[PDB]
Design an enzyme around this catalytic site. Structure first.
Site, PDB file in Angstrom:
ATOM      1  N   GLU A  14      34.488  45.097  50.300  1.00  0.00           N
ATOM      2  CA  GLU A  14      34.624  45.061  48.850  1.00  0.00           C
ATOM      3  C   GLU A  14      34.831  43.625  48.402  1.00  0.00           C
ATOM      4  OE1 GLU A  14      37.718  47.554  47.398  1.00  0.00           O
ATOM      5  OE2 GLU A  14      37.141  47.350  45.295  1.00  0.00           O
ATOM      6  N   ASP A  15      33.830  43.073  47.720  1.00  0.00           N
ATOM      7  CA  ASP A  15      33.974  41.822  46.992  1.00  0.00           C
ATOM      8  C   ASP A  15      34.251  40.654  47.923  1.00  0.00           C
ATOM      9  OD1 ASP A  15      33.600  43.309  44.753  1.00  0.00           O
ATOM     10  OD2 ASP A  15      35.713  43.355  44.171  1.00  0.00           O
ATOM     11  N   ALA A  16      34.409  40.924  49.211  1.00  0.00           N
ATOM     12  CA  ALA A  16      34.862  39.886  50.117  1.00  0.00           C
ATOM     13  C   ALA A  16      33.676  39.152  50.711  1.00  0.00           C
ATOM     14  CB  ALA A  16      35.712  40.499  51.224  1.00  0.00           C
ATOM     15  N   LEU A  17      33.504  37.899  50.315  1.00  0.00           N
ATOM     16  CA  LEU A  17      32.351  37.139  50.755  1.00  0.00           C
ATOM     17  C   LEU A  17      32.564  36.790  52.221  1.00  0.00           C
ATOM     18  CD1 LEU A  17      32.363  36.989  47.618  1.00  0.00           C
ATOM     19  CD2 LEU A  17      31.245  34.779  47.833  1.00  0.00           C
ATOM     20  N   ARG A  59      30.332  46.673  38.856  1.00  0.00           N
ATOM     21  CA  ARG A  59      30.550  45.534  37.979  1.00  0.00           C
ATOM     22  C   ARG A  59      29.343  45.308  37.087  1.00  0.00           C
ATOM     23  NH1 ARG A  59      32.898  45.269  42.579  1.00  0.00           N
ATOM     24  NH2 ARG A  59      35.154  44.878  42.569  1.00  0.00           N
TER      25      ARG A  59
END
Ligand SMILES: [Zn+2]
Ligand SMILES: [Zn+2]
Ligand SMILES: [Zn+2]
Ligand SMILES: [Zn+2]
Lengths: 46, 1114, 216, 48, 67
Positions: free
Chosen positions: B733-736, B917
């Protein structure tokens, strides 16, 4: 030089005594900075 | 080369911002201040003599700054950036010409310096003003710093532009229960004063004015207001027929049952309930007892002499509460901008200054009075030096004010605090970003619903993107990129000019006029309500747009509320836009070649009548176009371009119109928190905290906004290639997640600078605090802990310093604070040396240090420590499009794909962010990126503008990449084809504050705070973490006995109280004290916070006597 | 001061490394303390005249733009002067003027008695004699002795002109110093030789100014 | 409730105000110099 | 501050090219990509840094301590 340090603006080698004053000579300008040590220094690039 | 009628407009905005600067708001109003206002200020009080000395006077004449009649601008003054290091206030002397009286036939004058003024950067009087790039150089400070911020005591801050509710205007708030309060609050110089009026009980409607006592019947009022008819009273406030007659007339009824006319009783009953006259000068107690202040209490907006003016002012005011009480709706809600006004720093310094100066000279009466006490010889030597001993308390008091932020003004009887913030340099965007900010305050409680959200009226005259997560007790709002805050012009010339149009006066009015036309309101003040609404507006606007009263002083109508409002109040939001002249624009599209030629400039469109600044209310009257492409002959204006609608920070988002707005919000709140070059002055400035980036890069996409501020010359971020994919399930989740042999190649690297000053001051024993150092035991080396220097006894350039070492050795006398005596012999040493130690996880470097002096002539040492941070696991990385994420598990190299030419993505990012998003703007930006490189261009994008998508297709396919912006990749591990085409390419990213290495915080056993005897507060000083009640009780749902104890007791405050069964109370060691036995005591363990609470109680009289009992034997 | 219970080492070393922030001696390994407990965040004729005395004191002090710190010297002196009843018998301006003068003199700053005094009506010989009395009443020594080497600076700052003055200053100082050497210095006002070497080396730098300006 | 312990309804108006124990009146760090940062309640009662 | 000697992706040596690039842009003004294309840049990640990386050192040497 191997003497101590430099002005801010005038930018010239200057020493100082102990407990004298910080005002430079070449310039009446007050603030001044310290020259980098002649001593060796080491990193490792990586 | 003829120009598109669309694309030509784009050269206006820069030329608009070219001449007149982006931040003028402070700049002008500060310049406008130092230039105009003071010459008026002292023109208020130029004359003082105490009560004494039959022939004396002290007459102020001139105020100047920098000009004592040597040169024009100040002959010499300290450079601002140099002062930033001297850590002084950065100010300018106040040259003041005053003619005094001293002795026989003298009446003499000079120039004087009463003090210094903390000027503002890039002002008129600023040294930086019109200084070309060498004076930047030779003066050692950046060209691209917009300035517009003060600097004092080595810090800088800003005056935050604070929005204040529109003042001196009739406003009706409609609230259930109640009865719909009307309020108008007005201020001129003295007496900023609120006033209220409203029903209390059932149509019976009264004045609440804290001046008077309370609850005054309005019909009696308007009687005393000079209109005695009682007929045209009703007819006036009411109308012609409808039902409005009786709806109001109830008061008129029970008005009559008391008294009549206006000899005494009208004015008298007012003065009958008026508060005291404050002893002396009560003689105004009369039949006209209040008659002087009957008119003037909270109605200063007009005052004057006869009573008809404000009389009808109150009348029309009453019209709104009767039209209100008719129905809900049909009222005014404190929301839409025009009914609120931001107000610039210019007047802030005005008020605060002139009031400090005010009370100053008020006390300067006394300053000559002590001399004036005993007639020693003949008393003259007019206190010319004696101002000095009294002086600079203005300057000083002004300094501590302007930095501190607490403004106490007791002449205005009102106090605002937190008026300023520490100036934000975390990044370049923040610079102008912390400027162009707006504060909201007051507005009843914070729960009050109305003054909250973003309303549509806000369109284009503020920012609508930025409202950061710091909402809290108030609100910040940001301007547009085309803004003009209006200066208050003038009143009478435009008034009598209104008469020149042939308007009429209240004196000539029938007092039947709720039928005639609409109304005319100057400042929102009725005059005649001239006949023929429209052509009136035509003629005057035609004045404005052509010959006169430029800026604002515009005009707008209202059909429902019958008025045409035309007042000249400044601090009012404005903006340009293109008049459509009859059929189409006044521009006529050829005049812009006459612009781009280089000889046109700006402000011409005003004087040649093309475009002008307008008001929300004005445009509430007007009808605006969007594209010259799509217009109506019935239109009025078009605004040159939409994308001035975005805010100064919001201008960064490529193609924002393809997002959902909250991601633009977060994107602004992140942008200013990015990290970048700051300014060209970079390595020559030393600030309490700093970040930067090793290899910043222009974002492959531009927004023509960026082209304005030259943000491309100061990028914050990397232009980094990415492949959208879920690869390396460490992602989630969202973690590059990143690329070694890229981070190894210098990707995303940050020099982190900090500074620690140590003031060196002398102490009354007259022994300086000393830098002594260089021990060097052990035959040739100073001990490791003390090996952090050279013979100087202070830190030096270019040294790894591991925590535990000395980056300054500060020796202070342990007797320094003692009481010196008129003796000394040999040793004035007695030093308790407190060198400060670099603490932290990871080595830093001292590459620069400064020995210098402050203003008081004392030794001051300032050092700056730095460490570069390889972007380790767990770093916030903004995708600049709204994706706010941690760096995930760093891949080696081979893992993650490579494809054809072997180009390996750097960041590798989860798709799932994009669906929920729901932001496709980025998804376009990547296309544009892979495009631009392949054609070899930067790529425009802007709100409703920039490069469109379809063109890129051909742009890409010709050079061989799928127009869909996708390509195959190959398994970072397996080395086979990837089973679905991947969308990947260039995107601009950026790195943020909240670097993990700063943030990671832990303790084993850390310090305890003396009062509560338990772990200290938060990060920094040392650790401890927060089990809140709401946090705690979560454990109770699991019902863990011991986990509480170990957690909230054994590891929290470890203590044993000693008590006494008989009369349970808490002793110490072996005594029960008040019952003194030293026997019956039982020792047991308790939270020390408990016993604390006890003694705290039993301090106060109370007895929670602890009776005890065994654990065992059942 | 504290000593270990076992090794009885007289020296204790504080460990801030791991952020235990503890205290233990290299002799034992047995800590001195756990979690050093730290902190965070009337009307009398004398005392009232100390209120007013600070009011006057500070105000008239930095009317000269003198350093705030230095003022507290005299504040003690003034308070010290209260003890011997040197304060009451004469004017207050004498008092504060005196105690400030003894500070700046003792602290070797650049300010002048005839100057400093001139803030008033005063003949300046008056408060000079006041300062002269507390030489008896307080008990002092060689401490207050100055030379133009200081005062040329404060003078040099006041004449603006150009920065060659600094070059001139160096020229002037040793000049006066030789004049100090040639024995014409003592027994006369140092300001005289100061402005003298001013006109001399400024004359050496050939900038035409007036004696009015010098004595100014 | 009375049974010769506290003291019937008399105590509830002050007579001897007990001084709060010193630890609960922590003297703030002298923080360099001679003037130590005070603590409040002790100032209050010390006026009392 | 000065063009990274290798890119963040290929890490093919950039350093030589910047000077030769910048000159090749000033002397003989020519299309950017094509310049690089006949300067020998193919891979676009390699390419971005020549199309990008505003040089901050030349704008710094305006300011220097020594002068
Ligand atoms: Zn110099
Ligand atoms: Zn007991
Ligand atoms: Zn020990
Ligand atoms: Zn590459």
């Amino acid at each position: 030089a191997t003497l101590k340090y430099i002005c801010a603006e005038c930018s010239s080698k200057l020493s100082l005594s102990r407990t004298d004053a910080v005002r430079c000579k070449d310039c009446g300008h007050r603030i001044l900075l310290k020259a980098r040590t002649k001593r060796l220094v080491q990193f490792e690039a990586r | 080369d003829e120009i598109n009628t669309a694309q030509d407009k784009w050269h206006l905005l820069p030329a608009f911002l070219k001449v007149k600067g982006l931040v003028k708001q402070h700049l002008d109003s500060f310049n406008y201040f130092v230039d105009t206002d003071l010459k008026k200020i002292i023109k208020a009080n130029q004359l003082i003599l105490s009560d004494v000395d039959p022939e004396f006077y002290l007459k102020y004449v001139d105020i100047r700054v920098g000009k004592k009649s040597s040169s024009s601008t100040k002959d010499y003054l300290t450079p601002p950036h140099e002062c930033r290091l001297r850590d002084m206030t950065y100010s300018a002397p106040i040259y003041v010409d005053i003619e005094y009286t001293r002795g026989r036939n003298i009446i003499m004058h000079k120039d004087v310096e009463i003090g210094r003024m903390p000027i503002m950067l890039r002002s008129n009087k600023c040294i930086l003003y019109d200084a070309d790039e060498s004076k930047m150089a030779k003066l050692n400070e950046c060209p691209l710093d917009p300035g517009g911020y003060f600097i004092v005591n080595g810090t800088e801050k800003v005056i935050l532009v604070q929005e204040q509710l529109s003042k001196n205007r009739i406003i009706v708030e409609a609230d259930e229960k109640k009865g719909i309060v009307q309020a108008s609050v007005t201020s001129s110089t003295h007496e900023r004063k609120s006033k209220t009026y409203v029903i209390t009980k059932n149509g019976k409607i009264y004045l609440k004015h804290n001046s008077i006592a309370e609850e005054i019947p309005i019909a009696i009022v308007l009687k005393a207001c000079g209109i005695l008819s009682d007929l045209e009273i009703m007819q006036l406030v009411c109308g012609n027929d409808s039902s409005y007659q009786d709806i109001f007339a109830v008061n008129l009824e029970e008005s009559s049952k008391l008294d009549i006319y206006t000899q005494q009783q009208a004015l008298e009953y007012i003065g009958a309930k008026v508060k005291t006259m404050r002893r002396q000068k009560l003689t105004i107690l009369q039949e006209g007892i209040e008659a002087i202040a009957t008119t003037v209490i909270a109605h200063l907006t007009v005052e004057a002499l006869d009573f008809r003016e404000k009389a009808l002012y109150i009348a029309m005011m009453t019209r709104r509460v009767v039209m209100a009480m008719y129905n809900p709706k049909m009222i005014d809600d404190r929301d839409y901008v025009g009914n609120k006004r931001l107000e610039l720093a210019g007047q802030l310094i005005s008020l605060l200054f002139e009031d400090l100066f005010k009370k100053f000279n008020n006390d300067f009466k006394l300053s000559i009075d002590k001399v004036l006490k005993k007639p020693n010889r003949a008393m003259e030597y007019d206190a010319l030096l004696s101002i000095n001993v009294h002086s600079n308390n203005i300057t000083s008091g002004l300094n501590r004010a302007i930095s501190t932020g607490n403004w106490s003004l007791k002449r205005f009887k009102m106090e605002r605090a937190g008026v300023t913030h520490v100036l934000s340099r975390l990044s370049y965007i923040s610079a102008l970003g912390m400027m162009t900010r707006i504060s909201s305050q007051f507005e009843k409680s914070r729960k009050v619903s109305g003054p909250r959200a973003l309303q549509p009226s806000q369109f284009g005259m503020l920012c609508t993107a930025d409202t950061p997560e710091g909402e809290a007790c108030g609100l910040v709002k940001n301007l547009a990129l085309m803004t003009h805050i209006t200066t208050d012009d003038e009143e009478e010339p435009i008034k009598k000019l209104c008469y020149v149009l042939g308007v009429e006066d209240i004196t000539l009015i029938d007092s039947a006029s709720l039928h005639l036309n609409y109304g005319v309101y100057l400042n929102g003040t009725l005059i005649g309500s001239i006949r023929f609404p429209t052509k009136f507006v035509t003629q005057f606007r035609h004045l404005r747009r052509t010959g006169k009263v430029s800026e604002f002083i515009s005009i707008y109508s209202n059909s429902h509320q019958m008025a045409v409002h035309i007042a000249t109040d400044g601090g009012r939001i404005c903006r340009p836009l293109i008049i459509v002249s009859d059929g189409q624009s006044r521009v006529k599209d050829i005049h812009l070649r006459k612009l781009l030629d280089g000889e046109l400039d700006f402000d011409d469109f005003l004087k040649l009548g093309l475009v002008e600044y307008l008001d929300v209310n004005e445009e509430n009257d007007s009808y605006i176009a969007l594209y010259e492409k799509d217009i109506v002959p019935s239109m009025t204006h078009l605004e040159i371009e939409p994308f001035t609608i975005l805010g100064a920070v919001a201008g960064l988002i490529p193609y924002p119109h393809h997002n959902q707005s909250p991601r633009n919000t977060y994107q602004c709140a992140m942008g200013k928190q990015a990290i970048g070059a700051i300014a060209y002055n970079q390595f020559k400035r030393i600030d309490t905290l700093l970040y930067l980036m090793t290899y910043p890069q222009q974002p492959m996409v531009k927004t023509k906004t960026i082209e304005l501020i030259d943000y491309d010359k100061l990028p914050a971020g990397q232009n980094a290639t990415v492949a959208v994919m879920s690869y390396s399930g460490y992602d989630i989740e969202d973690a590059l997640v990143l690329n070694k042999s890229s981070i190894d190649r210098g990707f995303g690297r940050c020099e982190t600078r900090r500074k620690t000053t140590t003031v060196l001051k002398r102490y009354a024993n007259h022994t300086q605090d000393i830098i002594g150092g260089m021990r060097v035991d052990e035959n040739g080396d100073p001990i490791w802990q003390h090996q952090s220097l050279g013979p100087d006894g202070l830190g030096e350039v270019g040294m790894k310093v591991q925590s535990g070492q000395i980056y300054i050795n500060k020796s202070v006398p342990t007797n320094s604070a003692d009481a010196p005596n008129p003796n000394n012999v040999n040793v004035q040493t007695q030093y308790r040396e407190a060198p400060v130690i670099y603490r932290g996880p990871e080595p830093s470097h001292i590459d620069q240090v400064m020995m210098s002096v402050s203003d008081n002539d004392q030794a001051l040492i300032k050092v700056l420590l730095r460490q570069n941070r390889r972007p380790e696991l767990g770093d916030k990385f903004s995708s600049r499009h709204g994706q706010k994420g941690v760096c995930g598990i760093i891949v080696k190299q081979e893992d993650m794909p490579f494809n054809d030419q072997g180009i390996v993505p750097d960041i590798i990012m989860n798709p799932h962010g994009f669906p929920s998003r729901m932001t496709v703007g980025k998804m376009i930006e990547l296309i544009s990126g892979k495009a631009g490189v392949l054609n070899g261009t930067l790529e425009y994008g802007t709100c409703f503008g920039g490069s469109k998508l379809e063109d890129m297709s051909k742009i890409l396919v010709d050079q061989g990449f799928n127009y869909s912006g996708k390509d195959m990749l190959y398994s970072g591990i397996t080395g086979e084809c990837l089973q679905a085409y991947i969308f990947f390419g260039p995107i601009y990213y950026q790195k943020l504050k909240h670097m993990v290495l700063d943030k990671m915080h832990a303790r084993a056993r850390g310090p305890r705070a003396v009062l509560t005897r338990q772990p200290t507060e938060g990060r920094s000083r040392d650790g401890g973490l927060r089990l809140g009640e709401m946090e705690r009780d979560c454990v109770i749902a699991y019902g863990a006995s011991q986990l509480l104890l170990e957690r909230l007791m054994i590891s929290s405050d470890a203590f044993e109280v000693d008590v006494c069964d008989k009369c349970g109370l808490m002793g110490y060691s072996g005594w029960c004290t008040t019952c003194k036995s030293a026997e019956n005591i039982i020792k047991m363990t308790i939270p020390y916070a408990a016993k604390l609470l006890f003694q705290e109680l039993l301090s106060m009289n109370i007895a929670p006597r602890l009776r005890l009992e065994d654990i065992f034997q059942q | 001061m504290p000593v270990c219970k076992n090794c009885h080492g007289t020296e204790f070393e504080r460990d801030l490394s791991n952020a235990n922030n503890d205290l233990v001696c290299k002799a034992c390994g047995v800590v001195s303390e756990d979690n050093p407990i730290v902190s965070e965040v009337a009307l009398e004729s004398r005392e009232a005249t100390l209120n007013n005395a600070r009011r006057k004191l500070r105000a008239v002090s930095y009317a000269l733009h003198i350093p705030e710190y230095i003022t507290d010297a005299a504040f003690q002196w003034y308070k010290l002067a209260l003890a011997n009843n040197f304060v009451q018998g004469r004017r207050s301006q004498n008092v504060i003027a005196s105690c400030l003068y003894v500070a700046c003199r003792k602290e070797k700053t650049h300010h002048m008695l005839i100057d400093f005094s001139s803030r008033l009506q005063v003949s300046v010989y008056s408060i000079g004699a006041t300062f002269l009395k507390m030489v008896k009443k307080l008990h002092i020594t060689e401490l207050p002795l100055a030379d133009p080497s200081l005062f040329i600076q404060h003078f040099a700052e006041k004449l603006d002109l150009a920065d060659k003055k600094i070059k001139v200053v160096k020229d002037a100082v040793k000049l006066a110093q030789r004049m100090s050497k040639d024995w014409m210095f003592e027994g006369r006002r140092p300001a005289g030789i100061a402005g003298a070497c001013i006109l001399l080396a400024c004359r050496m730098n050939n900038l035409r100014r007036t004696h009015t300006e010098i004595v100014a | 409730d009375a049974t010769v312990p506290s003291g019937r309804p008399e105590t509830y108006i002050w007579r001897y105000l007990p001084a709060p124990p010193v630890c609960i009146r922590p003297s703030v760090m002298m923080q360099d110099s001679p003037a130590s940062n005070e603590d409040d309640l002790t100032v209050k009662l010390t006026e009392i | 501050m000065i063009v990274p000697v290798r890119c963040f992706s290929c890490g093919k040596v950039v350093g030589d090219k910047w000077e030769s690039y910048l000159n090749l842009l000033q002397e003989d003004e020519l299309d950017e990509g094509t310049a690089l294309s006949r300067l020998g840049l193919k891979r676009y990640c390699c390419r971005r840094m020549i199309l990008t990386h505003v040089d901050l050192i030349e704008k710094f040497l305006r300011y220097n301590p020594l002068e």
